[PDB]
Design a protein around this ligand. Sequence first.
Ligand SMILES: NC(=O)c1ccc[n+]([C@@H]2O[C@H](COP(=O)([O-])OP(=O)(O)OC[C@H]3O[C@@H](n4cnc5c(N)ncnc54)[C@H](OP(=O)(O)O)[C@@H]3O)[C@@H](O)[C@H]2O)c1
Ligand SMILES: NC(=O)c1ccc[n+]([C@@H]2O[C@H](COP(=O)([O-])OP(=O)(O)OC[C@H]3O[C@@H](n4cnc5c(N)ncnc54)[C@H](OP(=O)(O)O)[C@@H]3O)[C@@H](O)[C@H]2O)c1
Ligand SMILES: NC(=O)c1ccc[n+]([C@@H]2O[C@H](COP(=O)([O-])OP(=O)(O)OC[C@H]3O[C@@H](n4cnc5c(N)ncnc54)[C@H](OP(=O)(O)O)[C@@H]3O)[C@@H](O)[C@H]2O)c1
Ligand SMILES: NC(=O)c1ccc[n+]([C@@H]2O[C@H](COP(=O)([O-])OP(=O)(O)OC[C@H]3O[C@@H](n4cnc5c(N)ncnc54)[C@H](OP(=O)(O)O)[C@@H]3O)[C@@H](O)[C@H]2O)c1
Lengths: 242, 251, 247, 250
Amino acid sequence: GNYQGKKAIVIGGTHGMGLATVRRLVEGGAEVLLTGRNESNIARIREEFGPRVHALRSDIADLNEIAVLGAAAGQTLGAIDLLHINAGVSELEPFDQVSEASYDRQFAVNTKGAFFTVQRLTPLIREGGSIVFTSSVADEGGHPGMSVYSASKAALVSFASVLAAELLPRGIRVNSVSPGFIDTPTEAERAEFKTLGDNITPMKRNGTADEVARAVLFLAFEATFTTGAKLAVDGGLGQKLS
Amino acid sequence: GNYQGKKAIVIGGTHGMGLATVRRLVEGGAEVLLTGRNESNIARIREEFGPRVHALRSDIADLNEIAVLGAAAGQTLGAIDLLHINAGVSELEPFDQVSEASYDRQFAVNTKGAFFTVQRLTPLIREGGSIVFTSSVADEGGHPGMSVYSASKAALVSFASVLAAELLPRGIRVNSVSPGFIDTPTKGVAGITEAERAEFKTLGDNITPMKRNGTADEVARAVLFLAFEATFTTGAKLAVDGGLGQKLSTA
Amino acid sequence: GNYQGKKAIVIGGTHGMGLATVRRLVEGGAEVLLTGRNESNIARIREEFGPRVHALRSDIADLNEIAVLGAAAGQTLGAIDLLHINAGVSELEPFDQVSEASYDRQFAVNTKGAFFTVQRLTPLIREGGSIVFTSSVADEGGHPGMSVYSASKAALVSFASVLAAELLPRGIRVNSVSPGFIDTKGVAGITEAERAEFKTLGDNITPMKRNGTADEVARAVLFLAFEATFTTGAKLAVDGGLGQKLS
Amino acid sequence: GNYQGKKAIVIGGTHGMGLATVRRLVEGGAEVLLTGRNESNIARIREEFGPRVHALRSDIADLNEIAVLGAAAGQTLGAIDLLHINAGVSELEPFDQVSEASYDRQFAVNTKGAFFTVQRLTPLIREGGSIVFTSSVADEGGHPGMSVYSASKAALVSFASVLAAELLPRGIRVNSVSPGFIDTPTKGVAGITEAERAEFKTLGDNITPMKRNGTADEVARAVLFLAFEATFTTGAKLAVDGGLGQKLST
Ligand SMILES: NC(=O)c1ccc[n+]([C@@H]2O[C@H](COP(=O)([O-])OP(=O)(O)OC[C@H]3O[C@@H](n4cnc5c(N)ncnc54)[C@H](OP(=O)(O)O)[C@@H]3O)[C@@H](O)[C@H]2O)c1
Ligand SMILES: NC(=O)c1ccc[n+]([C@@H]2O[C@H](COP(=O)([O-])OP(=O)(O)OC[C@H]3O[C@@H](n4cnc5c(N)ncnc54)[C@H](OP(=O)(O)O)[C@@H]3O)[C@@H](O)[C@H]2O)c1
Ligand SMILES: NC(=O)c1ccc[n+]([C@@H]2O[C@H](COP(=O)([O-])OP(=O)(O)OC[C@H]3O[C@@H](n4cnc5c(N)ncnc54)[C@H](OP(=O)(O)O)[C@@H]3O)[C@@H](O)[C@H]2O)c1
Ligand SMILES: NC(=O)c1ccc[n+]([C@@H]2O[C@H](COP(=O)([O-])OP(=O)(O)OC[C@H]3O[C@@H](n4cnc5c(N)ncnc54)[C@H](OP(=O)(O)O)[C@@H]3O)[C@@H](O)[C@H]2O)c1
């Protein structure tokens, strides 16, 4: 009865890392509210789980949607122990090929959408609770073709730090996981990507969504003297190993 | 110490650190073009310097103006050794006070405009040349009331890294300076008054390990070292912060 | 059965966070060999834990004794899943007062002894096993009075990185915990008075405004040891934010 | 004229980047005292500079010799504006092959010797002066064959931090430079063959993002910038590494 009586919101929990995090929460006995954008993913969840989990379709980028999301969460959960921010999008292109539209899209979801979602949902967080952000190994260093994604994630990591400072009086810890290549789901080059992660990750494999899930829930419930910190789940990729 | 035959663009060079940088560039023999958003600041620049430097009123946040700026630079300088991105704005707000408008404003100038300005001007940059970003000690760690500003600067540092990686085949270095409470007429924050700046400066004196504010010239020296002397340096950061971001357990 | 069948070595597991790590190990079903120096501590732990622990009096700074621990560990445990290096000493003094003797004591234990202990015991570590080092928030930045201690832990963190790289082909992960102020009944002594004054300092400079518990560090060591299977060369702060630049 | 009237001590300035720093100091009008362990290299320094520089055989690893150097520095320079700790050794060994002797030799020069040299000479540094340490890109991250050297430099960088904090009230700044595969006669590893240095050099050209080794002068320029121009900089690190330590995924 580990997560018994605990309540969590996972933003972007219909899929991959978020969903793996949802599975551990539910099997640990927690009550979970999760969001996603895609109709198909929500449909699957609503069938597989039932009313021990609340699947809400909600665009992280829409501030009006965020306000309604906060009203519903407060109604359903009342108050929570964990807010997990997981939603993220990426468009790989060389720096001089970035258009204003592609630039805006990625920052809308990855940075601004996350900030205002956090701003709306933070008053529901109980003392002793926490926020865990899903970042990326890309949040430090220079990776060609990821100028916008890497930068949107670096900003998110900065938000976690200031949120960790400003939320001290409320006894809410704020931390980030930094995943490398994680094997989860355009297929034929989604495939080419997983190979890259195999070649270049020092541990020579992709991570599992459950490995990220484990790191998220550790920071949430066990790292009770940890705030403003970052935790690598990258097979050594961000750790300067030759 | 001599920039004879060099040409440089300073985005946000109308006062403070950027202007200090302009001054050393000119005094060393550089051909310089600078921008600013405020019009009377531009007038003062044209008076101090005369036809010696090219000063353009140009909003960094505006993509049409960035295009106009690009053509102007290509027309007046043709090809450059240094692009200094210095422009910044900041609005101090506790995290639950931040509005969409104030959020958008700071990212528009500090992050998006810097990205697209660099995108438009990078073709002018010659082999051996460099881009220097002005970041902030706030680009790392948690400073209350500076959530948006810190994040917009953290984003800029990331861009500096990816640019350093992508521009390697062009032999263009990309680095960042990180101040630092710097004694300047805006203090980095335009909205506040003279009263609230004098207090911001004093906060600087108290919490800076070296017990003082930096000068604009100290920042300028670091920008120009990175631009012209640090020829084996790229993707790096150089602190000009009196120790503030260096984890010195005083006081 | 959480750590059922598991085998671990905790270097300096006689007190505090090393001892809290031993406890969580034994409670989850692991067999542990630990080392230390204090007679009463070692005797007490033998008494408490019986056949689940092997407690050895072994000076981490003594290379002759490291060789004996290697024979003993290999004889008593054979193959292991976790090597936890926790042992450390601190001597607080301004830089201009550090003696050669005081400098040597801290490095002998915190760094060299750690290095040669890891060198000697690494061959026992199973594939899929790991090493965890106890560092300190002092391993980065500048803290007056702690020049030697800070440098010694900074060297340890470096060792951890190079080991994480060299041990990739064995499938052995190498990570570090970086504790801040951690609190340590009811016994008298001059150590225990010095511990009190330091605890008090930690209460009011740590951003979370309290010391951490030994169990909090132990939980982080054992997460890295057994749960962070895609984590190596990494550092994990248990410092109430002290190391994370929060104003 | 830019270092006119200044006095500097370079610890390890008989060749390589230490010598590049000395040469830049002397062109700028500085008065310089430099050290090295190799008496033949010291003879070569006196051949080049004559008496415009003070050159002393002084083993950084020996505390007795450090004490002697402290007296000699006092007598010769009186007070100084720059202390540059550059001396170093490296021995490349897989971790499982490191012997007590090889470990001791590297920490004795790189860490302990550096510490007690700074401790003995700090009283000579005057108002507004500084200390600069030469670290390495190896002081962060994991590089096989370099467990001892990397840890010894990682330790040096921590010393710089604490010293920057403890020396604040004396108005003395303390910073480090971090090369970088640098083209020096030893490549920082004095004990290997020239076949292995050439390979080390080639490795440098391949893994370095800027795809070349750095020059000794490039490091010298960064040391002297920190020494004299970075007057609001302390406890900081400056990369001179062609991007190697900056996580460029090229
Ligand atoms: N993939 C990697 O290897 C990797 C590496 C580093 C970091 N990360 C980070 O890890 C996070 C999660 O990755 P993943 O494994 O879940 O793969 P992913 O394809 O990044 O999934 C992102 C998640 O966010 C949801 N989402 C996207 N836009 C949304 C919006 N506007 N509103 C609400 N939800 C939205 C998606 O749900 P729907 O698809 O149902 O809308 C999906 O659940 C991302 O933030 C990413 O930046 C991933
Ligand atoms: N001052 C500090 O202590 C401090 C500390 C850390 C970081 N920084 C950063 O260092 C940089 C320089 O700051 P500062 O205090 O010297 O002056 P500042 O008030 O940040 O202004 C910097 C320059 O940017 C220009 N600028 C502002 N908005 C612009 C826009 N929309 N388009 C084009 N240019 C624009 C300003 O010109 P106009 O006003 O004429 O438009 C000015 O010349 C800033 O990025 C700041 O955030 C400053
Ligand atoms: N507690 C804090 O506030 C704090 C703050 C910063 C860093 N740390 C670090 O966290 C780690 C644990 O700290 P701690 O406070 O528990 O240290 P501690 O109170 O001194 O205890 C350390 C443990 O290591 C053992 N040990 C000490 N010297 C040894 C030697 N020469 N050979 C073998 N074993 C030896 C001790 O055994 P005996 O009991 O038999 O002597 C003890 O069990 C240390 O490495 C320390 O550097 C702690
Ligand atoms: N070269 C590189 O690629 C590289 C890269 C990263 C870091 N580094 C570091 O940068 C620094 C300079 O390296 P380098 O390649 O120019 O030369 P180096 O072979 O490391 O030697 C530098 C200086 O240290 C002196 N030295 C060595 N042992 C000494 C002792 N016991 N006492 C006093 N002086 C001693 C040498 O003088 P004598 O030989 O005349 O005794 C030489 O002048 C070193 O600290 C090195 O570890 C070098």
